[PDB]
Short mmCIF file of C-alpha atoms in Angstrom, two decimals:
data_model
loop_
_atom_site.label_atom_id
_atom_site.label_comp_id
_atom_site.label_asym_id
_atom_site.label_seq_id
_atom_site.Cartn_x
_atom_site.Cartn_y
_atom_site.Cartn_z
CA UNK A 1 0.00 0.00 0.00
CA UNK A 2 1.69 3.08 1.63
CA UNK A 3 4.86 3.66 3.85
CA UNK A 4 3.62 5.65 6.83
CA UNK A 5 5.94 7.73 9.83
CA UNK A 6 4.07 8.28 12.82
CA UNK A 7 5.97 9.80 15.99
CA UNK A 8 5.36 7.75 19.44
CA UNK A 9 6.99 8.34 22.43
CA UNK A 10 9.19 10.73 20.35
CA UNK A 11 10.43 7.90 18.27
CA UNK A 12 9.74 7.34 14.66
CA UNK A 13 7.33 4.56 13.97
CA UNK A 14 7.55 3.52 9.71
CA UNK A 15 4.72 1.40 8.87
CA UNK A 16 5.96 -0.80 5.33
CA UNK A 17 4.06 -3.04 3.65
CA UNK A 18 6.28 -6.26 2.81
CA UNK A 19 6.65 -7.85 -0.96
CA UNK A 20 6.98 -11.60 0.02
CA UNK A 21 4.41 -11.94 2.88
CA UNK A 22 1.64 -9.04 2.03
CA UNK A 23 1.62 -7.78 5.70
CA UNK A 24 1.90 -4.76 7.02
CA UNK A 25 5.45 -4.55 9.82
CA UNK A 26 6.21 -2.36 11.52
CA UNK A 27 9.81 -0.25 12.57
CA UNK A 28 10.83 1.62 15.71
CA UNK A 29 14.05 3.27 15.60
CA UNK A 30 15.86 5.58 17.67
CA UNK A 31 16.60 8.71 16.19
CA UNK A 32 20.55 9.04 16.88
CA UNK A 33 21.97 6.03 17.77
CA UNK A 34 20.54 4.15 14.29
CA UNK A 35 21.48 4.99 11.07
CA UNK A 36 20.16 4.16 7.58
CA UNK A 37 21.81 1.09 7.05
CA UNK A 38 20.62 -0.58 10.45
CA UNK A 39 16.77 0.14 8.66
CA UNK A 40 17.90 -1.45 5.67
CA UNK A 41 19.15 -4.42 7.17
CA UNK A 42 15.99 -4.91 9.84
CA UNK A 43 14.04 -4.76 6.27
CA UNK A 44 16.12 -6.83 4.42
CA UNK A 45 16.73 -9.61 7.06
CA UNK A 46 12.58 -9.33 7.73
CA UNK A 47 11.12 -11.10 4.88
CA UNK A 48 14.33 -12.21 2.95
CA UNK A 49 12.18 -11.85 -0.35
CA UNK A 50 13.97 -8.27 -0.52
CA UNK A 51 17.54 -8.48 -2.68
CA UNK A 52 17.71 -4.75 -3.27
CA UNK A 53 16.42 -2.18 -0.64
CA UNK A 54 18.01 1.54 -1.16
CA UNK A 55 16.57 5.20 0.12
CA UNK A 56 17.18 8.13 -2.30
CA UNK A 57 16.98 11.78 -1.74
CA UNK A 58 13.47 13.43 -3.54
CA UNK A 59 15.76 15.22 -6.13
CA UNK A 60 17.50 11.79 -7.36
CA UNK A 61 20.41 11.11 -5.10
CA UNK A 62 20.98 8.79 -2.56
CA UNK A 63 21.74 8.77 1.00
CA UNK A 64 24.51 6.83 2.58
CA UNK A 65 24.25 3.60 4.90
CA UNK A 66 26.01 5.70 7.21
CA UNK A 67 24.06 9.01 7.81
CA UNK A 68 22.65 9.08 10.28
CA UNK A 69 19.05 8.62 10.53
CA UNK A 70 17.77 12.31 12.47
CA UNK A 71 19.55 13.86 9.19
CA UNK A 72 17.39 11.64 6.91
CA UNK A 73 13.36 12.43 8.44
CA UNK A 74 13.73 15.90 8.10
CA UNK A 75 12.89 16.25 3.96
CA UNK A 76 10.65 13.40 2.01
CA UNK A 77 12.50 10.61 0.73
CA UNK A 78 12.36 7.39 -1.78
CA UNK A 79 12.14 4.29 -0.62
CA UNK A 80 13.13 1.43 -3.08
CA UNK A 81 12.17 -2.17 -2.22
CA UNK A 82 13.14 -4.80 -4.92
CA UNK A 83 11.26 -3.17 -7.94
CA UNK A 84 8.85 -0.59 -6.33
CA UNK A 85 9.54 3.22 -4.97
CA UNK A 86 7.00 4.38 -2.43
CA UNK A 87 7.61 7.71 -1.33
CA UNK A 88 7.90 8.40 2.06
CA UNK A 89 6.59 11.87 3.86
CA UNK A 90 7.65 12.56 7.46
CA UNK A 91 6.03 14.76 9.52
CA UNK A 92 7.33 18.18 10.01
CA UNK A 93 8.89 19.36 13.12
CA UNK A 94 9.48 22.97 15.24
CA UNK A 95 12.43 23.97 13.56
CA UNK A 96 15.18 26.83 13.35
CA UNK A 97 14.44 29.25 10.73
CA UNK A 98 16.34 29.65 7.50
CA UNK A 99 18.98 32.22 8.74
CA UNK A 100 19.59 30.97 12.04
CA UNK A 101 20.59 27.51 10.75
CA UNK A 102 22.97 28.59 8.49
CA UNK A 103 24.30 30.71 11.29
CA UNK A 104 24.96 27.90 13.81
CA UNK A 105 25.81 25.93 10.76
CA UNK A 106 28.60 28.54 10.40
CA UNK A 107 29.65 28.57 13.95
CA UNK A 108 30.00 25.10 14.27
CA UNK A 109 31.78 24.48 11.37
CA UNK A 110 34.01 27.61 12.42
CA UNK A 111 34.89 26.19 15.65
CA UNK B 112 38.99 23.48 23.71
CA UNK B 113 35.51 24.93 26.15
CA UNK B 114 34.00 26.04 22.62
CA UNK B 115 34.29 22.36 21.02
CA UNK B 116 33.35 20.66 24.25
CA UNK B 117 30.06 22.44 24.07
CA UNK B 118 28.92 21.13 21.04
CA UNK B 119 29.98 17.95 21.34
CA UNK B 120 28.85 17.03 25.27
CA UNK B 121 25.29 16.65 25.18
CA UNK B 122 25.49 13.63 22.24
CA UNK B 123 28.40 12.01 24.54
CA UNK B 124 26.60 12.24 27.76
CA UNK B 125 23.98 10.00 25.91
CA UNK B 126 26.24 7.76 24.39
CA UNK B 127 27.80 7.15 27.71
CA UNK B 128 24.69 7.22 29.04
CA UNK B 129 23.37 4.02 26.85
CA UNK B 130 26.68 2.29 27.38
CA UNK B 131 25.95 2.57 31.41
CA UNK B 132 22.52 1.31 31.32
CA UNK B 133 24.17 -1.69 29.09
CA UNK B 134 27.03 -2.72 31.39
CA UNK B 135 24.66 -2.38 34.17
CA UNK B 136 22.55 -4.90 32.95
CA UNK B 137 25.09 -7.05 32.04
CA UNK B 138 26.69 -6.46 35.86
CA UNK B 139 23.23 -8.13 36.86
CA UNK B 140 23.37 -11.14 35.33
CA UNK B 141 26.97 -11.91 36.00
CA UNK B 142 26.61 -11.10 39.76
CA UNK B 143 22.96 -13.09 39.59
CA UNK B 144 24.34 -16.48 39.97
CA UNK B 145 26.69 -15.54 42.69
CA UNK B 146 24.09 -14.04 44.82
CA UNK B 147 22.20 -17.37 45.96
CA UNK B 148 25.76 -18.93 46.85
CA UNK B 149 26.55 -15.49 48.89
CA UNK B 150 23.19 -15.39 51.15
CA UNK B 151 23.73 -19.36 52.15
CA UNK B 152 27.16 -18.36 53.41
CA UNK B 153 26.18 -15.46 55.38
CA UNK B 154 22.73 -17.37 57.11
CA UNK B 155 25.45 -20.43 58.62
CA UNK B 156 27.24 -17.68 59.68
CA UNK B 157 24.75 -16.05 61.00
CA UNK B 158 23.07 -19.51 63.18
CA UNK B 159 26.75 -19.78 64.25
CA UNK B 160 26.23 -15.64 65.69
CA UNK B 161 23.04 -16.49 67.43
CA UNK B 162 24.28 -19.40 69.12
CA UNK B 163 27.36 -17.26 70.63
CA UNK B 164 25.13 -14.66 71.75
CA UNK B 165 22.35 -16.73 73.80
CA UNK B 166 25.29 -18.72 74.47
CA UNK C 57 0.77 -3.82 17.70
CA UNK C 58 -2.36 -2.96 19.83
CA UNK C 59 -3.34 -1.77 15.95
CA UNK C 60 -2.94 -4.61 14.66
CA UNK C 61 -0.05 -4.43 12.55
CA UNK C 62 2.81 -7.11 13.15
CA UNK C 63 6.03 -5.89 15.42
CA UNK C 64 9.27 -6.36 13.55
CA UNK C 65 11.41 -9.26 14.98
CA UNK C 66 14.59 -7.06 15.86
CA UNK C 67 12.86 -3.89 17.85
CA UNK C 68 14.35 -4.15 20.77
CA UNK C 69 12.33 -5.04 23.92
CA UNK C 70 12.67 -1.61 25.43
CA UNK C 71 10.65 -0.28 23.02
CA UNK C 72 8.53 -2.64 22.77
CA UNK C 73 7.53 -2.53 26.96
CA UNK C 74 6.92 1.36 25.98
CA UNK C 75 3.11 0.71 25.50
CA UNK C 76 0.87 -2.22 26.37
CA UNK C 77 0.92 -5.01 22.95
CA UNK C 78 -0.74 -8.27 21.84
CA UNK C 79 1.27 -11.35 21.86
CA UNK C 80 -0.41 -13.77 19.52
CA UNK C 81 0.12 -18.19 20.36
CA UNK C 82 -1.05 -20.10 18.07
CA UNK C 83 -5.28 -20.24 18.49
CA UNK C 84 -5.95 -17.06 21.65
CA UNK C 85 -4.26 -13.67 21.88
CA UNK C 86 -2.94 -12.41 25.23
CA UNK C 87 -3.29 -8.92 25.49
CA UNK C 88 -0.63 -7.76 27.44
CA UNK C 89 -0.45 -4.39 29.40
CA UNK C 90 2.93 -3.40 30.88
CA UNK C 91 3.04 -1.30 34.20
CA UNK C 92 4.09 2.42 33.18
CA UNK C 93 7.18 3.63 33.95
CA UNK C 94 8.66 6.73 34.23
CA UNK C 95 12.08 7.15 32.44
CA UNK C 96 15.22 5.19 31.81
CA UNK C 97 17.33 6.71 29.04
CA UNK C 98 16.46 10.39 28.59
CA UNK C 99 16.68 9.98 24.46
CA UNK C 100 14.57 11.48 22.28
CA UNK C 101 14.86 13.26 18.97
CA UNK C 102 15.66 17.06 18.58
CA UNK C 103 14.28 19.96 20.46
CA UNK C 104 14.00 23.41 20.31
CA UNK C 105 14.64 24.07 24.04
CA UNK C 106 17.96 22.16 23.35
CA UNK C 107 19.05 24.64 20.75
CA UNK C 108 18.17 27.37 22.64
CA UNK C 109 20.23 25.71 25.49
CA UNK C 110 23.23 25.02 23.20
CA UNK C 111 23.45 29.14 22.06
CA UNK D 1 -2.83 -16.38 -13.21
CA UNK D 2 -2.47 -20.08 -13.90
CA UNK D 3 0.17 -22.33 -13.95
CA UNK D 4 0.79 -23.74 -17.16
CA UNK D 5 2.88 -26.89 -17.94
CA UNK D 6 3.76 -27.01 -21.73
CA UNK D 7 5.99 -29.52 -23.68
CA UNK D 8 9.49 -27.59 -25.85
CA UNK D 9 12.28 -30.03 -27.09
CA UNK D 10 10.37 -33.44 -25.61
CA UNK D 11 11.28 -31.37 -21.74
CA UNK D 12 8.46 -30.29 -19.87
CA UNK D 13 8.58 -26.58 -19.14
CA UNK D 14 6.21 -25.44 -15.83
CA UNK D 15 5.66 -21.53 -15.89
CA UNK D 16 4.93 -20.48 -12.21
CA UNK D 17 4.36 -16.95 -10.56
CA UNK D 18 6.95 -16.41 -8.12
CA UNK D 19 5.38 -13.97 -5.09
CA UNK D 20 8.44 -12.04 -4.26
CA UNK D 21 8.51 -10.18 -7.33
CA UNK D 22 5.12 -10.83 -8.74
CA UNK D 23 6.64 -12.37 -12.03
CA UNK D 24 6.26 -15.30 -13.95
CA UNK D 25 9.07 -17.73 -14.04
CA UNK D 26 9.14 -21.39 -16.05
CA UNK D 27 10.96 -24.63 -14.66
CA UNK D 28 12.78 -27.04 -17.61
CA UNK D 29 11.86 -30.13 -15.90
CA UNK D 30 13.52 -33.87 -16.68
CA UNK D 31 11.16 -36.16 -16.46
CA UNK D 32 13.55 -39.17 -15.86
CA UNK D 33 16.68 -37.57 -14.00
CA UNK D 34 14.33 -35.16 -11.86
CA UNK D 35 12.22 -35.73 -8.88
CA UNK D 36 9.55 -33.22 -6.72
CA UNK D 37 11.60 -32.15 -3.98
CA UNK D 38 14.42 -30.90 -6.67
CA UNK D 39 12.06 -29.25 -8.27
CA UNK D 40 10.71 -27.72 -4.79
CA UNK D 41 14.52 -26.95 -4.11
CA UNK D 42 14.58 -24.95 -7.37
CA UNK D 43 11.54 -22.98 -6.75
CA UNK D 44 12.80 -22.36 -3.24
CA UNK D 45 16.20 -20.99 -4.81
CA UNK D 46 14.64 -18.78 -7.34
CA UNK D 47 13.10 -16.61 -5.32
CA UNK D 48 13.49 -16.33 -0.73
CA UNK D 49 10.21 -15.88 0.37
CA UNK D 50 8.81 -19.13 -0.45
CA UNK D 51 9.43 -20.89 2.54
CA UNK D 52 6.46 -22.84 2.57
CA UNK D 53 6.07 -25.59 -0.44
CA UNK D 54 4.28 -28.08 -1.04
CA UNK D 55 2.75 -30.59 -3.06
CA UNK D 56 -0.35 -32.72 -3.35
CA UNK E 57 47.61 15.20 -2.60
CA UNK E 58 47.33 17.97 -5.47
CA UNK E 59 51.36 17.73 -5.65
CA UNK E 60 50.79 13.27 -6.58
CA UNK E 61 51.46 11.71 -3.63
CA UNK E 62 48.99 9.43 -1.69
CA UNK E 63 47.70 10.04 1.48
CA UNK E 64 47.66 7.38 4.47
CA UNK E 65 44.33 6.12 5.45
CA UNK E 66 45.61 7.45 8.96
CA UNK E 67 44.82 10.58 8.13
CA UNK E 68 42.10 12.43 9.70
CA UNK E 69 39.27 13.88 7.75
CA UNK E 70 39.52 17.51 8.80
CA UNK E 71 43.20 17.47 8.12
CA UNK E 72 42.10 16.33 4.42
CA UNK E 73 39.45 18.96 3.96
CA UNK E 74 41.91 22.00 4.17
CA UNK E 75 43.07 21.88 0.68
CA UNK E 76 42.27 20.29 -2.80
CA UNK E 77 42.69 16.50 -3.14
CA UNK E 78 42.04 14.25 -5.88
CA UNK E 79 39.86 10.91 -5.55
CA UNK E 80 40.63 7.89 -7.53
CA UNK E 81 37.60 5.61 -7.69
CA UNK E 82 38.47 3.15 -10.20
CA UNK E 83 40.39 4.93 -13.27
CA UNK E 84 38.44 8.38 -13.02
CA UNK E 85 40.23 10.87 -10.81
CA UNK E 86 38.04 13.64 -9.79
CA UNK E 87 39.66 17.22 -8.79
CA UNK E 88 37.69 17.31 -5.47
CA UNK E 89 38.05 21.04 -4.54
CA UNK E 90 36.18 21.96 -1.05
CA UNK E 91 34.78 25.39 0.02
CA UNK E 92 37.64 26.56 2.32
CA UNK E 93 37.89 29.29 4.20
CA UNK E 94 40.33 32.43 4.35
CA UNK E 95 44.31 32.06 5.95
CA UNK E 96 44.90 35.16 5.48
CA UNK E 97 42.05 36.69 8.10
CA UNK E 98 42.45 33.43 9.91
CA UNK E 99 44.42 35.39 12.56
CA UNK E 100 42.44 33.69 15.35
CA UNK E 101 41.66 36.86 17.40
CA UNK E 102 39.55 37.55 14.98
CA UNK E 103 37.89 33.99 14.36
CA UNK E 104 36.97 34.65 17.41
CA UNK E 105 35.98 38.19 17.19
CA UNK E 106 33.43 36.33 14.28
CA UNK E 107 32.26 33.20 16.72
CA UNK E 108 31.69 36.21 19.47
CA UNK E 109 29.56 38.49 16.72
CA UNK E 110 27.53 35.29 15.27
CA UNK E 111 26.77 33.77 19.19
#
């Protein structure tokens, strides 16, 4: 069907619907500690009918097995499993505005 | 130094923080089995206490 | 899930005993409803009071 | 979806749909050399998420 | 290193990411030029007279 992200407990919750089985499971992950690579393999090693599992960025890129994965639910992204890209839509948080981010971006990359 | 300790203390105090809980849990279990052979000791040694003092 | 959707074999048990769950055996389904606790790793995900605490 | 078994080259040729992938996929089968639980270990190596065959 | 010679897997990442370096993936080398900033204002009374005006 759909790939959902709920918040519970402040914790993302993604809701995937599996190709081999036809059940909906369900993932919990902590937002520091993880990264995208530890979601791949819980999917992967879930229902073994996945070969290829990947998550792009919405403009075409991908993201890295290493990012973390607070860096990844802040945009949309693409979700490939085995043939089939659902697109995934977090839900937005209370954020920093556009000039104050780039100015703490620019003090802690100038410390 | 006290301007790159700031911005990197609060995601080390958590990572420390998990590693805590973890070897606390795993302290548990090793000292678990221990336990029941430590309280049989100390009640014989305790029988042996009582009998001194109404003794 | 108390939803009804399945629980992914490698959550970890900590967050699973979050919220009360369903554990399905093979004919009846035990509904099963933790006692609440409090905290015991102050984790979460990001926070404006934590920003305004880092300036 | 059916699954069809035809004949090409005197070798029986079985055309099953696999679930993983939701595509067909066809078996060369030899009907002398062959038995059912090769054939059940090929359709279990084609594709992981068939982890329940049988055959009756 | 822009001058031909390799660098040591040793070598930390912010070391690297002070000048241009060239990446050989399999035959392709790619310039790899990062956005670095001044060492001529990098007198670091006045870094620090810019980390005091941004905080």
């Amino acid at each position: 069907d759909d790939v959902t992200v709920v918040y519970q407990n402040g914790l993302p919750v993604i809701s995937v619907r599996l190709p081999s089985r036809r059940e909906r499971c369900q993932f919990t992950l902590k937002p520091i500690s993880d990264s995208v690579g530890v979601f791949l393999r819980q999917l992967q090693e879930e229902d073994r009918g996945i070969d290829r599992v990947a998550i792009y960025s919405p403009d075409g890129v991908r993201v890295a097995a290493s990012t973390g994965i607070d860096l990844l639910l802040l945009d949309d992204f693409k979700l490939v499993i085995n043939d089939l890209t659902y697109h995934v839509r977090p839900p937005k948080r209370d954020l920093l505005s556009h000039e104050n981010a780039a100015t703490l971006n620019d003090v802690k990359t100038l410390v | 130094q006290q301007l790159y300790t700031t911005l990197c203390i609060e995601q080390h105090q958590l990572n420390k923080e998990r590693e805590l809980i973890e070897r606390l849990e795993d302290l548990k279990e090793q000292l678990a089995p221990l336990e029941k052979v430590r309280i049989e000791i100390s009640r014989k040694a305790e029988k042996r206490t009582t009998l001194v003092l109404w003794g």
